[PDB]
């Protein structure tokens, strides 16, 4: 009913935008374990996008009057169009920022 | 008359050979008969701790006793009814006679 373009298309655009492409892995380092900036995972990209959208929708839908359906729909549209406000996309870009910082 | 032989044993081999010899003698005697109706096998389970005292891992064991019950319903003269009932008697298998 909103965003009258293709609904699966906006869904997939949100998935790609929220899918993190640089992450951090625990490197032993020696005593002080560090983070290592690792690129490359398409399956993990889509997996993390789905997980991020779901947990953001449920965090929005916890303890409030708006129902999980409209919270999830708003999160999907916000992530698809790009607003730097949705919880999934903020977490993804913050993880990206720390990954590039410790890169 | 509608007599009935029902057998409620535990040893499947003796159960099956009792049934087989009964049906084979009936077939060779050329009577009218109903097939052996074979009730579901009833398994008695007892679940108990292996240990006598309470020490060790909480490990359990299940002792199972299997009971096989079959029955056959016949109509015949009294003399041959008693003949069929009293021949082919085997230890371990318990059989009894009912009506209708």
């Amino acid at each position: 009913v909103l965003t009258d373009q293709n609904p699966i298309q906006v869904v997939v655009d949100a998935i790609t935008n929220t899918g993190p492409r640089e992450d951090t892995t625990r490197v032993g380092g020696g005593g002080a374990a560090r983070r290592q900036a690792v690129d490359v995972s398409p399956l993990r990209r889509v997996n993390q996008a789905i997980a991020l959208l779901t947990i953001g929708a449920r965090e929005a839908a916890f303890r409030n009057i708006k129902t999980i359906a409209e919270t999830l729909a708003e999160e999907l549209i916000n992530a698809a169009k790009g607003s730097s406000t949705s919880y999934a996309i903020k977490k993804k870009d913050e993880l990206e920022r720390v990954a590039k910082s410790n890169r | 008359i509608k007599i009935r032989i029902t057998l409620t044993s535990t040893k499947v081999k003796q159960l099956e050979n009792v049934s087989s010899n009964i049906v084979k003698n009936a077939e060779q005697h050329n009577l009218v008969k109903k097939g052996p109706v074979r009730l579901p096998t009833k398994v008695l389970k007892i679940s108990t701790r292996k240990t006598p005292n309470g020490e060790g891992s909480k490990t359990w064991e299940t002792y199972e006793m299997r009971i096989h019950k079959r029955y056959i319903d016949l109509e015949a003269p009294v003399q041959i009814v008693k003949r069929i009932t009293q021949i082919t008697i085997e230890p371990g298998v318990d059989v009894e006679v009912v009506v209708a």
Binding site: - | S57, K58, T59, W60
Partner: protein, 141 residues
């Protein structure tokens, strides 16, 4: 002799017996139409085969499904597998074997599980745990 074929769809415990015969072209479950069980979701799920194959193949065929066992999803899955197998048996026994083959090809192309019954039978539970593989808790002190 009214030509009826007996198939059955299976699940964890849901058994659905399907009687498919030459009639007026109806589908009924427990004497009530498949179209009017009103789940609003499982209705479409059981429509799936009928929607994908069209009404060309149910001109004068009556299919009666008697269900017993399992939850709602298990029952509808048993229903769909039984009705698919019943239509397959009808189109093999009476309609052309070529028609049966092409019907099964379309069913497989839409989904491979349409033809194959699920066999993920429940795993028995062992002592020392609440479930099949889960243990209770390992407290040391």
């Amino acid at each position: 002799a009214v030509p009826s074929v007996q198939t059955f769809g299976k699940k964890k415990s849901a058994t659905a017996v399907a009687h498919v015969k030459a009639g007026k072209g109806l589908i009924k479950v427990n004497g009530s139409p498949i179209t009017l069980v009103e789940p609003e979701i499982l209705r479409f799920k059981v429509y799936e085969p009928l929607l994908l194959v069209g009404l060309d193949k149910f001109s004068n065929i009556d299919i009666r499904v008697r269900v017993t066992g399992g939850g709602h999803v298990s029952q509808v899955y048993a229903i769909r597998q039984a009705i698919a197998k019943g239509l397959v048996a009808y189109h093999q026994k009476y309609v052309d074997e070529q028609s049966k083959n092409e019907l099964k090809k379309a069913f497989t192309s839409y989904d491979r599980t349409l033809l194959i019954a699920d066999s993920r039978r429940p795993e028995p539970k062992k002592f020392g745990g609440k479930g099949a593989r889960s243990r209770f808790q390992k407290s040391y002190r």
